[PDB]
Write an enzyme that holds these catalytic residues in place. Sequence first.
Site, mmCIF file in Angstrom:
data_model
loop_
_atom_site.group_PDB
_atom_site.id
_atom_site.type_symbol
_atom_site.label_atom_id
_atom_site.label_comp_id
_atom_site.label_asym_id
_atom_site.label_seq_id
_atom_site.Cartn_x
_atom_site.Cartn_y
_atom_site.Cartn_z
ATOM 1 N N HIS A 68 30.082 -56.444 -9.195
ATOM 2 C CA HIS A 68 30.198 -55.639 -7.792
ATOM 3 C C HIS A 68 30.098 -56.805 -6.897
ATOM 4 O O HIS A 68 29.694 -57.722 -7.206
ATOM 5 C CB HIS A 68 28.585 -54.862 -7.514
ATOM 6 C CG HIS A 68 28.190 -53.872 -8.637
ATOM 7 N ND1 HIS A 68 28.451 -52.521 -8.290
ATOM 8 C CD2 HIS A 68 27.998 -53.724 -9.622
ATOM 9 C CE1 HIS A 68 28.206 -51.857 -9.356
ATOM 10 N NE2 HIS A 68 27.719 -52.521 -10.343
ATOM 11 N N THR B 234 23.268 -47.827 -11.062
ATOM 12 C CA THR B 234 23.449 -47.951 -9.583
ATOM 13 C C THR B 234 24.644 -47.342 -9.171
ATOM 14 O O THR B 234 24.878 -47.522 -7.878
ATOM 15 C CB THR B 234 23.559 -49.649 -9.443
ATOM 16 O OG1 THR B 234 24.907 -49.938 -10.062
ATOM 17 C CG2 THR B 234 22.435 -50.362 -9.734
ATOM 18 N N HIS C 30 27.163 -57.323 -14.423
ATOM 19 C CA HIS C 30 26.413 -56.179 -15.061
ATOM 20 C C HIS C 30 26.815 -56.002 -16.568
ATOM 21 O O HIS C 30 27.833 -55.804 -16.787
ATOM 22 C CB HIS C 30 26.270 -55.001 -14.486
ATOM 23 C CG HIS C 30 25.477 -54.767 -13.222
ATOM 24 N ND1 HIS C 30 25.820 -53.701 -12.272
ATOM 25 C CD2 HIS C 30 24.724 -55.893 -12.876
ATOM 26 C CE1 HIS C 30 24.971 -54.326 -11.260
ATOM 27 N NE2 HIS C 30 24.091 -55.041 -11.553
ATOM 28 N N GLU D 2 24.137 -56.346 -5.933
ATOM 29 C CA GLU D 2 23.166 -55.174 -5.649
ATOM 30 C C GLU D 2 21.690 -55.561 -5.581
ATOM 31 O O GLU D 2 21.086 -55.128 -4.547
ATOM 32 C CB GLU D 2 23.602 -54.293 -6.921
ATOM 33 C CG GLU D 2 25.106 -53.549 -7.243
ATOM 34 C CD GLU D 2 25.360 -52.566 -7.631
ATOM 35 O OE1 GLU D 2 24.847 -52.241 -8.721
ATOM 36 O OE2 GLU D 2 25.784 -51.546 -6.818
ATOM 37 N N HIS E 8 36.550 -47.992 -9.137
ATOM 38 C CA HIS E 8 35.120 -48.266 -8.226
ATOM 39 C C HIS E 8 35.021 -49.776 -8.785
ATOM 40 O O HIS E 8 34.323 -50.543 -7.902
ATOM 41 C CB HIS E 8 33.662 -47.376 -9.051
ATOM 42 C CG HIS E 8 34.297 -46.180 -9.160
ATOM 43 N ND1 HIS E 8 34.014 -45.330 -7.863
ATOM 44 C CD2 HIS E 8 34.244 -45.179 -10.003
ATOM 45 C CE1 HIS E 8 34.283 -43.980 -8.055
ATOM 46 N NE2 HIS E 8 34.680 -44.049 -9.356
ATOM 47 N N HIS F 56 30.899 -55.313 -16.144
ATOM 48 C CA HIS F 56 31.646 -55.157 -14.525
ATOM 49 C C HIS F 56 31.019 -55.895 -13.807
ATOM 50 O O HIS F 56 29.872 -56.330 -13.978
ATOM 51 C CB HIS F 56 31.962 -53.770 -14.275
ATOM 52 C CG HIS F 56 30.584 -53.044 -14.119
ATOM 53 N ND1 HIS F 56 29.969 -52.519 -15.140
ATOM 54 C CD2 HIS F 56 29.758 -53.136 -12.925
ATOM 55 C CE1 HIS F 56 28.700 -52.244 -14.726
ATOM 56 N NE2 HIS F 56 28.647 -52.463 -13.387
HETATM 57 O O1 7QS Z 1 24.574 -51.628 -14.086
HETATM 58 C C1 7QS Z 1 25.146 -50.790 -13.593
HETATM 59 N N1 7QS Z 1 26.140 -50.628 -12.670
HETATM 60 C C2 7QS Z 1 26.855 -49.494 -12.791
HETATM 61 O O2 7QS Z 1 27.885 -49.024 -12.264
HETATM 62 C C3 7QS Z 1 25.941 -48.290 -13.407
HETATM 63 C C4 7QS Z 1 26.830 -47.590 -14.579
HETATM 64 C C5 7QS Z 1 27.299 -46.319 -14.527
HETATM 65 C C6 7QS Z 1 27.927 -45.727 -15.427
HETATM 66 C C7 7QS Z 1 28.113 -46.387 -16.539
HETATM 67 C C8 7QS Z 1 27.955 -47.648 -16.782
HETATM 68 C C9 7QS Z 1 27.208 -48.365 -15.815
HETATM 69 S S1 7QS Z 1 24.369 -49.351 -14.235
HETATM 70 ZN ZN ZN Z 2 27.116 -52.317 -12.140
#
Ligand code: 7QS
Ligand code: ZN
Length: 258
Positions: A94, A196, A117, A104, A62, A92
């Site tokens: 996006h 998210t 994030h 996002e 992901h 991580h």
């Molecule tokens: O900031 C976020 N981004 C994400 O992918 C969400 C997430 C989901 C699961 C674990 C950690 C973070 S919360």
């Molecule tokens: Zn995230």
Amino acid sequence: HHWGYGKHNGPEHWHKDFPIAKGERQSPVDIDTHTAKYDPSLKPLSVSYDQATSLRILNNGHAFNVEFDDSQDKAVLKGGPLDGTYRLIQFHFHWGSLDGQGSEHTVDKKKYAAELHLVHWNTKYGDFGKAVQQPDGLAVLGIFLKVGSAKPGLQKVVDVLDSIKTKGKSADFTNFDPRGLLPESLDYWTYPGSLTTPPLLECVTWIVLKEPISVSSEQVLKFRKLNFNGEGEPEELMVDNWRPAQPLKNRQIKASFK
Ligand SMILES: O=C1NC(=O)[C@@H](c2ccccc2)S1
Ligand SMILES: [Zn+2]
């Protein structure tokens, strides 16, 4: 669960396995800078990352996560809207297929090329799994990425990506300093929201920095060479792994700044 970001299993589908997708405090949201109100009561934000211990970087299919040792208060977020102490567990990003999309959150409907994030959990709940079951369980520090000059403190991350191209690959990632990812200003917006990605839990205090960081086109192009797929499977480039803005509903976005 087989959720992802495609036509067939993307955000529009998530609600069928995860009905909270349509809940009252979903993230991300559009931050309307003319509606958000300065809140003079917000205490100052404290990012204490001097003792951070990075461990590993993982392609989870992901995104990629840079994981930290969160067995003690080594790297913590406090202050701002937060009561108590939140421990860094991972960061991580996006990102998009193109520089015009990827974030996002949006700012007056503007999409950034990517969003960082930094995920933290409230130590009063003892572990991350318990914290995600609480309305105040997590604090996510969100930082926008725009394409321009290179971000030197990002380059160790982009250089290891070749080694984790496919889902389920990890690499040792010690001694990475996440301070190198922050902008100069800590001015922020804050609101109550959610994870998210599934399971979409309504457990997050969102803290979104106003000041984006600049990364180079070359740096973000290397994010886009990652793969959603596992090794030996047909290539599906890891791009456009963002959820679009969700209804604000009965919430207020507060600004830390005038
Ligand atoms: O900031 C976020 N981004 C994400 O992918 C969400 C997430 C989901 C699961 C674990 C950690 C973070 S919360
Ligand atoms: Zn995230």
